[PDB]
């Protein structure tokens, strides 16, 4: 079998293959997640190089892992499917042996473990994927948001973004998100998600997709018109000044 050590140390202490896996994430379309008082909202951007896609059948950037946890990503699309499939199998296995759905913290810990494993096994390159994992623990009503990266490191966030121009939108979220008082409503939480994406995306109804996860497996993907109403309302706020 092919066992060549592809992920190795360099004189200055870097694993260059893990390093370059982040460069692929930087290339990937932007993804964002913000948690409210009683909700979490995941926002993603669509590429508009090709103006002739079929949106019914194209795999949307937000995947369900179980009925109560969702995962979005930035990076190589093909790699993300592999992580999603493994997470979905693990979710069913956890329900089988523990007789309880996964906690977001647990599912994150698993996905991060898979990514870490691919950084010190022979014959593999790391995943060129960072994930945003969001949802609600069973019986719990407290919002959970986590991020994993190609290195295998995971951590929770009040708000986070990954992908292209994520530096610009993180800069936005750092001054616009008040930890003292998180967005109290689902409405105002979606408002903040669109505002931060509009810094990167450009005037587009499509180009921005939103998914809202509420406690007890209540996950809904917003239509073009619903998102477009937020876009039409946000743009009219600037003109006042």
């Amino acid at each position: 079998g092919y066992d060549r050590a592809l992920s190795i140390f360099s004189p200055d202490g870097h694993i260059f293959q893990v390093e370059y896996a982040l460069e692929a994430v930087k290339r990937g379309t932007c993804a964002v997640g913000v948690k409210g008082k009683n909700c979490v909202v995941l926002g993603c951007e669509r590429r508009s190089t090709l103006k002739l896609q079929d949106t019914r059948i194209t795999p949307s950037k937000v995947s369900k892992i179980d009925s109560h946890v969702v995962l979005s990503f930035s990076g190589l699309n093909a790699d993300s499917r592999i992580l999603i499939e493994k997470a979905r199998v693990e979710a069913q296995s956890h329900r089988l042996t523990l007789e309880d759905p996964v906690t977001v913290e647990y599912l994150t810990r698993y996905v991060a473990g898979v990514q870490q494993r691919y950084t010190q096994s022979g014959g593999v390159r790391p995943f060129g994927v960072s994930t945003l994992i969001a949802g609600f623990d069973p019986r719990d009503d407290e919002p959970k948001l986590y991020q994993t990266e190609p290195s295998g490191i995971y951590s929770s966030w009040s708000a986070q973004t990954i992908g292209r121009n994520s530096k610009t939108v993180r800069e936005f979220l750092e001054k616009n998100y008040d930890r003292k008082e998180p967005p109290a409503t689902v409405e105002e939480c979606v408002k903040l998600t669109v505002r931060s994406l509009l810094e990167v995306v450009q005037t587009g109804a499509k180009n921005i997709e939103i998914t809202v996860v509420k406690p007890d497996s209540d996950i809904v993907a917003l239509s073009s018109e619903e998102i477009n109403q937020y876009v039409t309302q946000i743009e009219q706020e600037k003109q006042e000044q």
Partner: protein, 250 residues
């Protein structure tokens, strides 16, 4: 000892070329010219027996080989590569078809199996591609007569008539001028011998030329009588004498 060559030796270059497949085609270009012509009632494959010494017995070395009783093969390029491919192809016709369906594979499927073997040596760890192109002539009940070329890449194309190797370019031009979809087999053998005369530098006779056909069933070459549905092989190799007879009135 460990085979640590579990990685591809054929890889995409920046220009998109698969270097090792290109170089294999270059080897086929240096090879001796071989051809194939399809007629209405048969098919003919032909080549030159380039001898490495007048002491060497060229009768012991066949460039034309029977794969199944209705399918024959010829080549240009690396002789040794061809020989082992013939062995593998003969076996796969049995293991993949005759042992499952109780009959020999149709030409297109055996060709498909041969093509699969050559593709694998394009991608598998620790191997180089085969340095041969093949011309396979055959007959089956539901497809009639056919002729395929198989390249080092694993690709295959059906031909009405073609040539590979040294003088292929000049031979393909000679065939385009002479081929029509009304040719009788005896006419196709005549063109085949005319085409080959342009490639051969040395002696031109039944001893320096190897030529076989796919035509009618040969009950005489079967080896046994008794089964009405067993009528004999369609692959017949022409003898040195039979070739010379057609060369006297050429």
């Amino acid at each position: 000892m460990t085979d640590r060559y579990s990685f591809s030796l054929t890889t995409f270059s920046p220009s998109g070329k698969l270097g090792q497949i290109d170089y294999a085609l270059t080897a086929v270009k240096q090879g001796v010219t071989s051809l194939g012509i399809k007629a209405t009632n048969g098919v003919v494959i032909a080549t030159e027996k380039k001898s490495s010494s007048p002491l060497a017995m060229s009768e012991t070395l066949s460039k034309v080989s029977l794969l199944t009783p209705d399918i024959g093969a010829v080549y240009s390029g690396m002789g040794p590569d061809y020989r082992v491919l013939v062995d593998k192809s003969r076996k796969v016709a049995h293991t993949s078809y005759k042992r499952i369906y109780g009959e020999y594979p149709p030409t297109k499927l055996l060709v498909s199996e041969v093509a699969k073997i050559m593709q694998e040596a394009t991608q598998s760890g620790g191997v180089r591609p085969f340095g041969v192109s093949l011309l396979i002539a055959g007959h089956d009940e539901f497809n009639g007569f056919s002729l395929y070329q198989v390249d080092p890449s694993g690709s295959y194309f059906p031909w009405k008539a073609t040539a590979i190797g040294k003088g292929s370019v000049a031979a393909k031009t000679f065939l385009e001028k002479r081929w029509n979809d009304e040719l009788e087999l005896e006419d196709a053998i005549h063109i085949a011998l005319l085409t080959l005369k342009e490639s051969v530098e040395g002696e031109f006779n039944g001893d320096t030329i190897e030529l076989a056909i796919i035509g009618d069933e040969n009950p005489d070459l079967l080896g046994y009588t008794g089964i009405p549905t067993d009528k004999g092989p369609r692959f017949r190799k022409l003898t040195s004498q039979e070739i010379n007879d057609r060369l006297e009135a050429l």
